[PDB]
Amino acid sequence: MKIEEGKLVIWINGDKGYNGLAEVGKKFEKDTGIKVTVEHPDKLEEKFPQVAATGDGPDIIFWAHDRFGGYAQSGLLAEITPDKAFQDKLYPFTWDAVRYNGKLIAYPIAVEALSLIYNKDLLPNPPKTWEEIPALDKELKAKGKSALMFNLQEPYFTWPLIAADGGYAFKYENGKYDIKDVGVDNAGAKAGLTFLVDLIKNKHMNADTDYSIAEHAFNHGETAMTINGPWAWSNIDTSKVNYGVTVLPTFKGQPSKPFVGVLSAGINAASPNKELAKEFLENYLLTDEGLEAVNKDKPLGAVALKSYEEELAKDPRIAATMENAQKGEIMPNIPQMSAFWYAVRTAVINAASGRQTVDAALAAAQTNAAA
Amino acid sequence: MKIEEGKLVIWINGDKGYNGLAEVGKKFEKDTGIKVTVEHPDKLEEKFPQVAATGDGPDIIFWAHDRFGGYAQSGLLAEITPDKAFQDKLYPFTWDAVRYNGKLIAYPIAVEALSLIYNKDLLPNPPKTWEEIPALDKELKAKGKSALMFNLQEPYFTWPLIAADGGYAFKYENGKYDIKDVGVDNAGAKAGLTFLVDLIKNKHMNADTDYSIAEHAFNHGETAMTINGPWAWSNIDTSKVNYGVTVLPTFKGQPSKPFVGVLSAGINAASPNKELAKEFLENYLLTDEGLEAVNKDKPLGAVALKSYEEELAKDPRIAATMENAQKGEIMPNIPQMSAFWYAVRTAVINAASGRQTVDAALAAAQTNAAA
Numbered sequence: 001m002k003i004e005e006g007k008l009v010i011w012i013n014g015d016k017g018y019n020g021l022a023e024v025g026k027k028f029e030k031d032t033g034i035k036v037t038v039e040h041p042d043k044l045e046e047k048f049p050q051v052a053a054t055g056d057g058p059d060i061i062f063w064a065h066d067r068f069g070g071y072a073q074s075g076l077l078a079e080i081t082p083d084k085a086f087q088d089k090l091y092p093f094t095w096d097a098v099r100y101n102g103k104l105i106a107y108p109i110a111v112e113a114l115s116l117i118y119n120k121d122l123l124p125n126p127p128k129t130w131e132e133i134p135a136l137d138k139e140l141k142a143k144g145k146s147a148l149m150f151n152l153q154e155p156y157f158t159w160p161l162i163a164a165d166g167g168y169a170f171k172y173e174n175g176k177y178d179i180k181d182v183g184v185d186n187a188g189a190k191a192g193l194t195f196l197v198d199l200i201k202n203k204h205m206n207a208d209t210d211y212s213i214a215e216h217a218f219n220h221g222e223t224a225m226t227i228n229g230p231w232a233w234s235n236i237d238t239s240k241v242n243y244g245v246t247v248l249p250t251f252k253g254q255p256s257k258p259f260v261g262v263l264s265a266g267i268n269a270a271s272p273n274k275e276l277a278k279e280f281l282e283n284y285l286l287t288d289e290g291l292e293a294v295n296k297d298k299p300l301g302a303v304a305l306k307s308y309e310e311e312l313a314k315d316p317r318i319a320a321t322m323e324n325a326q327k328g329e330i331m332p333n334i335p336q337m338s339a340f341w342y343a344v345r346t347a348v349i350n351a352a353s354g355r356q357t358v359d360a361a362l363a364a365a366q367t368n369a370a371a
Numbered sequence: 372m373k374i375e376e377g378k379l380v381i382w383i384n385g386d387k388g389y390n391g392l393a394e395v396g397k398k399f400e401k402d403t404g405i406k407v408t409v410e411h412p413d414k415l416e417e418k419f420p421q422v423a424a425t426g427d428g429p430d431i432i433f434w435a436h437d438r439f440g441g442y443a444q445s446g447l448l449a450e451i452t453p454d455k456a457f458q459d460k461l462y463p464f465t466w467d468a469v470r471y472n473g474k475l476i477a478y479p480i481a482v483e484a485l486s487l488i489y490n491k492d493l494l495p496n497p498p499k500t501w502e503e504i505p506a507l508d509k510e511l512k513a514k515g516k517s518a519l520m521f522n523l524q525e526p527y528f529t530w531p532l533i534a535a536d537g538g539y540a541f542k543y544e545n546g547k548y549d550i551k552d553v554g555v556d557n558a559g560a561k562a563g564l565t566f567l568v569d570l571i572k573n574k575h576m577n578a579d580t581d582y583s584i585a586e587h588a589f590n591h592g593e594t595a596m597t598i599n600g601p602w603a604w605s606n607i608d609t610s611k612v613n614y615g616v617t618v619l620p621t622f623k624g625q626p627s628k629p630f631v632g633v634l635s636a637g638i639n640a641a642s643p644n645k646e647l648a649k650e651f652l653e654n655y656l657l658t659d660e661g662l663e664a665v666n667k668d669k670p671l672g673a674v675a676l677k678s679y680e681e682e683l684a685k686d687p688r689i690a691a692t693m694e695n696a697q698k699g700e701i702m703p704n705i706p707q708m709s710a711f712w713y714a715v716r717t718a719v720i721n722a723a724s725g726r727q728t729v730d731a732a733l734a735a736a737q738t739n740a741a742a
């Protein structure tokens with residue numbers, strides 16, 4: 001299983017508009033004769049570094065920009081070469097997210113942030129605070145509904161609450177991240193995680209809730225709210241739930257702070273098709289018609305391409321996404337991010353079960369993240 | 372020992388221009404017949420709450436604004452009553468420092484921040500970084516000079532270094548301080564204190580250095596630098612040392628962050644002379660001629676009175692003071708500040724001696740500050 005010259009294989013996560021991307025691929029193939037294959041492997045963010053290290057894997061890998069620093073450090077990504085005219089077509093802050101050691105290591109596609117999604121038929125006025133959700137849940141629970149269900153298995157989803165009162169990954173300083181200053185066991189993080197664990201131990205939420213269960217619950221009107229990204233909107237559209245996308249609730253009077261991801265496309269350093277990959281990404285995908293094809297499948301969020309974003313920006317769901325993004329922080333792209341996510345994922349799982357105390361769980365995560 | 376009606380007794384710290392203040396007092400006495408006594412007791416910030424609690428003490432107490440929240444909470448201070456025309460004469464941010472629970476509890480006099488003071492004859496180009504001071508000290512040490520001497524006994528002086536990399540007292544949030552989020556044992560504080568302790572353990576500085584020794588050393592040219600406030604300048608003037616006042620050095624590429632104090636004048640709630648005290652403070656002291664009398668004795672810093680500050684602002688020493696102030700933080704005035712200072716004072720003393728480790732010292736301070 002190697003990489004053939006003269007074809008493109010693209011990996012993208014299963015929650016994104018891979019069929020729409022495949023349509024852009026088929027258009028490229030029709031115009032050029034170059035076959036484009038789109039796959040969505042499980043755990044692609046882990047599989048890529050394993051297969052790319054041996055010189056194999058996809059020609060193009062899509063993921064949020066946070067994983068890309070580590071890929072690039074491991075020599076798995078090729079420096080990309082858009083010209084000044086091309087770079088001008090995307091927002092500068094999107095290029096920042098994909099710059100690593102003064103080198104662009106991927107094409108930015110779209111800016112993603114979690115929002116609060118609520119059922120307007122159940123909940124005309126969404127809660128402004130996390131604090132009021134317990135009582136709302138009790139009130140709803142007959143009705144026979146619940147207030148809030150979202151993916152508790154991945155720290156991406158729980159982090160906005162953890163960060164609200166002060167939790168953080170790595171301290172941003174002299175333009176760089178102090179990788180020895182990790183903010184996962186400070187009082188803010190502890191306050192956030194404690195509230196979350198309390199909701200679970202009091203059966204306002206279930207520790208086993210994952211993406212699939214929460215999506216089912218919201219999309220069939222069993223729960224009044226969920227937390228998710230723009231990729232989720234099209235299934236809600238199909239469900240016919242009358243939904244709103246809004247600012248996340250506050251905690252201790254402060255904004256929830258989602259970690260902002262820029263979906264990005266990197267080129268496998270081991271690919272003999274670097275020129276083709278550049279041509280596809282710049283002149284097929286990163287175009288109004290190309291982004292529209294993907295977006296129509298699953299919404300991308302706020303696209304990096306100025307010309308198309310100017311249209312999407314009029315959508316109140318996009319406005320809410322960017323409001324939530326502004327209240328959160330851009331993810332760092334440093335290689336240490338992988339250890340951070342792993343550390344936080346374990347801490348949340350362990351605390352939610354009652355296995356470890358919040359304090360003990362976060363103490364452990366702090367140590368793991370920082371070494 | 373009680374408080375007589377028809378006289379004013381003022382307490383002010385011994386490092387301030389108490390003789391100049393006494394001159395303003397004698398002017399008031401000449402105009403009105405009201406005797407004004409100025410004293411500078413030792414540990415006046417501790418003695419005041421002890422004596423004022425029993426209904427005794429000075430009619431007017433001067434200290435930086437940080438102690439005043441606790442005084443006011445204990446019912447020891449009278450709400451002051453300047454009118455809108457008077458309030459307009461001082462800078463709004465100075466009034467903020469003396470507001471406690473929506474009530475003004477003192478008259479602001481001047482804004483104080485520490486600066487780096489250096490001997491231009493020994494050291495034409497002052498170090499920009501804390502990191503370069505060890506090597507400079509070795510180079511100077513014959514010569515037979517030292518690089519830096521400043522008061523190590525009081526945390527006021529060591530805090531700017533401790534805060535540089537992230538240390539903090541109480542987290543500022545919804546306009547209020549989260550009194551359960553104390554930042555004295557995070558990685559930044561630990562990094563700061565560790566560097567300080569290293570300088571001491573390596574004999575670049577002496578753990579026993581206090582205000583008096585450091586002032587002697589600088590003012591007689593034995594050390595190239597000191598850290599101090601504007602009140603110190605007049606003795607340096609007299610010493611004839613060719614000195615500069617400049618931005619504090621950075622640590623880990625970040626500004627030293629001095630805690631900014633607003634010298635303030637409160638009225639003892641137990642005083643039968645509240646009207647007289649108001650009259651003296653508003654119409655004698657807080658005037659160009661009144662502040663000038665004090666300033667001429669020992670410089671006040673950047674005065675709260677707009678009209679006089681517009682003159683003082685042209686002094687590069689004042690510019691440097693305000694540059695350092697802008698890089699630091701205004702002290703909170705909450706009652707918890709007293710526990711904070713006590714906690715940090717002990718931690719620094721204990722670590723500097725080698726009694727406790729930096730980690731153990733700050734762990735202990737963290738607990739004490741937050742309870």
Ligand SMILES: OC[C@H]1O[C@H](O[C@H]2[C@H](O)[C@@H](O)[C@@H](O)O[C@@H]2CO)[C@H](O)[C@@H](O)[C@@H]1O
Binds near residue numbers: 015045065
């Ligand atoms: O949960 C940790 C996880 O968070 C992010 O993954 C997101 C991704 O950015 C979104 O595009 C969407 O697919 O949901 C994912 C969460 O399941 C980080 O990008 C990822 O590295 C990290 O492991």
Ligand SMILES: OC[C@H]1O[C@H](O[C@H]2[C@H](O)[C@@H](O)[C@@H](O)O[C@@H]2CO)[C@H](O)[C@@H](O)[C@@H]1O
Binds near residue numbers: 438525
């Ligand atoms: O060292 C802790 C101490 O710091 C401040 O005291 C300063 C004061 O603000 C200055 O005016 C000058 O007099 O030096 C003092 C340090 O010795 C706080 O105001 C004080 O409450 C605190 O104890």
Ligand SMILES: [Zn+2]
Binds near residue numbers: 001
């Ligand atoms: Zn193959």
Ligand SMILES: [Zn+2]
Binds near residue numbers: 019022023
């Ligand atoms: Zn297809």
Ligand SMILES: [Zn+2]
Binds near residue numbers: 039041
């Ligand atoms: Zn799949």
Ligand SMILES: [Zn+2]
Binds near residue numbers: 083085086
């Ligand atoms: Zn071009």
Ligand SMILES: [Zn+2]
Binds near residue numbers: 134135202204
């Ligand atoms: Zn409850």
Ligand SMILES: [Zn+2]
Binds near residue numbers: 171173181537623
């Ligand atoms: Zn740092």
Ligand SMILES: [Zn+2]
Binds near residue numbers: 216217
């Ligand atoms: Zn169901």
Ligand SMILES: [Zn+2]
Binds near residue numbers: 219220
């Ligand atoms: Zn259904």
Ligand SMILES: [Zn+2]
Binds near residue numbers: 220
């Ligand atoms: Zn169904």
Ligand SMILES: [Zn+2]
Binds near residue numbers: 327328329
């Ligand atoms: Zn921010």
Ligand SMILES: [Zn+2]
Binds near residue numbers: 372373374
């Ligand atoms: Zn008396």
Ligand SMILES: [Zn+2]
Binds near residue numbers: 390393
């Ligand atoms: Zn006198």
Ligand SMILES: [Zn+2]
Binds near residue numbers: 385410411412413
């Ligand atoms: Zn005295």
Ligand SMILES: [Zn+2]
Binds near residue numbers: 454456457
């Ligand atoms: Zn008036």
